[PDB]
From Swiss-Prot:
Cross-link (Glycyl lysine isopeptide (Lys-Gly) (interchain with G-Cter in ubiquitin)): K97
Assembly description: Component of the NF-kappa-B RelB-p52 complex. Homodimer; component of the NF-kappa-B p52-p52 complex. Component of the NF-kappa-B p65-p52 complex. Component of the NF-kappa-B p52-c-Rel complex. NFKB2/p52 interacts with NFKBIE. Component of a complex consisting of the NF-kappa-B p50-p50 homodimer and BCL3. Directly interacts with MEN1.
Annotated S-S bridges: none
Basic and acidic residues bias spans: 91-103
Post-translational changes noted in the entry: While translation occurs, the particular unfolded structure after the GRR repeat promotes the generation of p52 making it an acceptable substrate for the proteasome. This process is known as cotranslational processing. The processed form is active and the unprocessed form acts as an inhibitor (I kappa B-like), being able to form cytosolic complexes with NF-kappa B, trapping it in the cytoplasm. Complete folding of the region downstream of the GRR repeat precludes processing.
Protein name: Nuclear factor NF-kappa-B p100 subunit
Source species taxonomy: Eukaryota, Metazoa, Chordata, Craniata, Vertebrata
């Protein structure tokens, strides 16, 4: 899937969120989620989130509800400095490979 806004759902993966969540939460995190949300415009929700125990996830899944797409988020993360989260959400490239299967031989045995 190469879309996000069009569809009501985010083109992310269970594991993706798990990482993006923790990434934002940490002393090393060049940035943070609290500020990020503000950049997106969900500042009025920053409070309703921090209220829960796992706001990280409840923050992203909600970022789409408003009508945001991966792109928009990538813009905030970058401006904030969070480079990792960005490259992560984007995902690494894909290099073709061989099945390593022993092709059939000649006929008559």
């Amino acid at each position: 899937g190469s879309s996000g806004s069009s569809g009501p759902g985010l083109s992310l993966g269970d594991t993706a969120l798990q990482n993006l969540e923790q990434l934002l939460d940490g002393p090393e995190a060049q940035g943070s989620w609290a500020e990020l949300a503000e950049r997106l415009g969900l500042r009025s929700l920053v409070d309703t989130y921090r209220q829960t125990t796992s706001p990280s996830g409840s923050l992203l899944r909600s970022y789409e509800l408003a009508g945001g797409d991966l792109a928009g988020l990538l813009e905030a993360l970058s401006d904030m400095g969070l480079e990792e989260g960005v490259r992560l959400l984007r995902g690494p490239e894909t290099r073709d490979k061989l099945p390593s299967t022993e092709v059939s031989g000649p006929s008559s045995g």
